[PDB]
Amino acid sequence: SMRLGRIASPDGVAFASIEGELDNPGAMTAREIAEHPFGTPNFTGRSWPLADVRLLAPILASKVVCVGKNYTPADPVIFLKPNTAIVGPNVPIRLPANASPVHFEGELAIVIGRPCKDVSAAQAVDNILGYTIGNDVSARDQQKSDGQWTRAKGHDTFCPVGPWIVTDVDPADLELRTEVNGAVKQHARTSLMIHDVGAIVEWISAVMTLLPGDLILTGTPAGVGPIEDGDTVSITIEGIGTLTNPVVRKGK
Template identity: 55%
Template structure:
């Protein structure tokens, strides 16, 4: 298991890194065709900070108001799975739903009490996430920990793009090739530097930590046997199967 850098567009290869991707990159000299490797989640963060109701249309479909400040909650790192891994439906829930989201990945030296300008400098890159949610448990419990915290409830990947303009990207979710969510990042209530700055005034963000920026409208139920794909312009696609937890 190693970090690597994806190189090339037509016949992409992965160049193996010697160590982690933060700071000065050094390579081992090993390279493989992208098709010949198994991609894991590109990072295992110390924490996943999520933002609720950050798209007005999603707030409306959930029956809530747009918050005056970012609405924060956490997912444990054990929710992380990678591309093509299975989302497991827990027996405690009868209504598990997808949430397509742009993910921010924090770089060196991290972020603590930073302003907007410093926040942008603290970003290592961007990826795709699916904030899988047990909606019935979210409504029952009021707070989000159980509904958002089951193992496999944060598909993440397939890689981190370090050069991306986040300001106006299409965010799409398809279930069995049917489009369920379609939005654009320009419609976020609180933008990327605002979120990083706000979170950093609550908790120190460490290198590799992930912030999920909220989801557009269209969340819907997932069932065993489904294939769910979240795609974001400039980042590619993240696909996962849905299975019953056994």
């Protein structure tokens, strides 16, 4: 029953249990994890107020598997983002000088907690560490131009993830809200997903082995739109928190 994150503290880089009321992130306690972040974590004894440490991307994923069109049936359409696209909370998304329009896409993210393959939808729960937030950043011109979505979605910084992974949250009916400079762009519930978390894990794990720490982005609701130099994009998911990233365009 925890928020699993990663931190850069005085004593270095570590997993941590991030404790406290969600509406006061400053006064939250980062309780340093020693071993077994995907099993039963044990703790070093050290902790810091969260304000005192750098909050990082909550996982080092070997791959990011993603779902296309998934909000209100056709089979899931999946694609990959390279783990070099991942950044954590508050790290800038850097737009290539030549790419326009570049879109945000707020998404519920699944974090896989153990090696698995050929998992049934009903068994997905036993293989899921928990849930976090992803921003499936996408160069739309490049999507249309390539047909394949890989390049459009694969630029460095195009996979913000965080702020942390919640292990006990039920993904079936959670609100997701995306803001760009405080203006609401996406506003929907995960209960509108065409393929639910179990169906997504069943589908993907029938294709490829999923490893502890692997991320799955489960698709974005209506209201996708452009981001530009100077913008800030915040995605909030109920029961999880808020993933926020500034935006800069290269060459400015």
